[PDB]
């Protein structure tokens, strides 16, 4: 019958590893680098677009940074199509929580549920896993500013600063070097860009090859604002830090 053609996506190796999860992580390692840095008064999300073409429409584009709700955003690393499936699920889950409790969903609860979906594809169903790693940046009234990451295994962990995608080994060393706990948002913006500038596989880091976003309490009195940076705004912040 059909047994002949089954790849058996949800099995263990002799060494106790999940083949497909490991190979999905290998796929993600070739994706454009995405960095998240958490400060005391906000969070930065920076991401490198995959080898841009000059005729690509830059201003009306979205590849790396997606909005989940007013208080939570994600940076993507891997297959964009796979990420969008998961993102719409996450957007729906957040609204279900708001509908049920009349309160914005706590960041971890959203992350756990999305991570549990990934886990399911590794244990049952016979389907390939989602070739996606997320960086979750968000705020709630319990834990304040939070950074998480999830990967195809369905395992998630919290971070002060973290990178996913390509050159994470080199990127994590640079972040570990210059990061400190009493850091401000404006300083974190500078660190994020400097790290990408050194770990990039491109010749020089430019505005058209980047996506950028912040989550500050910079709005008027005790409320959070999400700022997805425009092309011209990235051009300005790149000059202001002295990279171009």
């Amino acid at each position: 019958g059909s047994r002949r053609y089954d790849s058996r996506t949800t099995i263990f190796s002799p060494e106790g590893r999940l083949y497909q999860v490991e190979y999905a992580l290998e796929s993600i390692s070739h994706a454009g680098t995405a960095i998240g840095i958490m400060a005391s008064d906000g969070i930065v999300l920076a991401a490198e677009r995959k080898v841009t073409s000059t005729l690509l429409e830059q201003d009306t584009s979205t590849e790396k940074l997606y909005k989940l709700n007013d208080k939570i955003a994600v940076a993507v690393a891997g297959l964009t199509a796979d990420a969008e499936i998961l993102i719409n699920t996450a957007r729906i889950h957040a609204q279900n929580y708001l509908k049920t409790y009349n309160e914005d969903i706590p960041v971890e609860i959203l992350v756990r549920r999305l991570s549990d979906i990934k886990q399911g594809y590794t244990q049952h169903g016979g389907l390939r896993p989602f070739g996606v790693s997320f960086i979750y940046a968000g705020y709630d009234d319990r834990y304040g500013y939070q950074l998480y990451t999830s990967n195809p295994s369905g395992n998630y962990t919290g971070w002060k600063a973290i990178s996913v995608g390509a050159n994470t080994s080199a990127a994590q060393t640079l972040l570990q070097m210059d990061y400190k706990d009493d850091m401000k948002v404006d300083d974190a913006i500078e660190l994020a860009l400097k790290t990408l500038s050194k770990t990039t596989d491109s010749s020089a880091l430019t505005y058209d090859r980047l996506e950028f976003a912040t989550i500050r309490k910079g709005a008027n009195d005790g409320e959070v604002y999400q700022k997805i940076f425009k092309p011209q705004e990235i051009k300005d912040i790149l000059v202001k830090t002295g990279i171009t």
């Binding site: 790849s7 290998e26 016979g126 389907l127």
Partner: protein, 250 residues
Amino acid sequence: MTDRYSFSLTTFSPSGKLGQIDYALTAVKQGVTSLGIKATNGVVIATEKKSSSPLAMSETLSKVSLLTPDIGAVYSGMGPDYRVLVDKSRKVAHTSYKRIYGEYPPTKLLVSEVAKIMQEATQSGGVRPFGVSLLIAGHDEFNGFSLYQVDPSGSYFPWKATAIGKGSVAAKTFLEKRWNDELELEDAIHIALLTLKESVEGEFNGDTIELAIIGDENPDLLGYTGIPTDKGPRFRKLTSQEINDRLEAL
């Protein structure tokens, strides 16, 4: 009996490649060249009509398809896969949008729905990916004119101008030299015909070329009068004669 193929036929290889998607892209490479160019006051999409036989009527086979009154589509790759995608794309525009909001979806969201269908063929049980890349041109009130590409993986990207299929590498280079942000629609049509002549080998006329535009509203193509807000479709397929007129002053 029954579909026993409930498992994925597309899986990750040790190197991290999704084989079936890569092979689907290879099928698109073999396909005939199609392109799209965005102007300030419109969008143009074009392709060569590769005829299987001279006895065949190439008018009956339409490579450029209307999805909504303001959105059109063209492809490169496997024709049959494209035909069913157009059917599904037209239906999803109604079921998941028009029947809810009482209006046609904006270009980006319809593209998103088509991308979802193509992504599912990459992960669902007992199916192969679609062997096509789409170029979807459209207009909507709040976003204006837009042009999108959609790949077998389900990934989509917005373009100022681009090409896909056989001679896409050369065609993209040609478009980089000619494209600017001040192009009028007629200028974009002219450039589209120049670009397409390079990839076409045999006859080059209105009968062998298929070309449509997303431009101004067409009250004459609406089919009725009396409602001021309804002004007609922005999608218009250029006729065989209309193409030949522009080939003289080329």
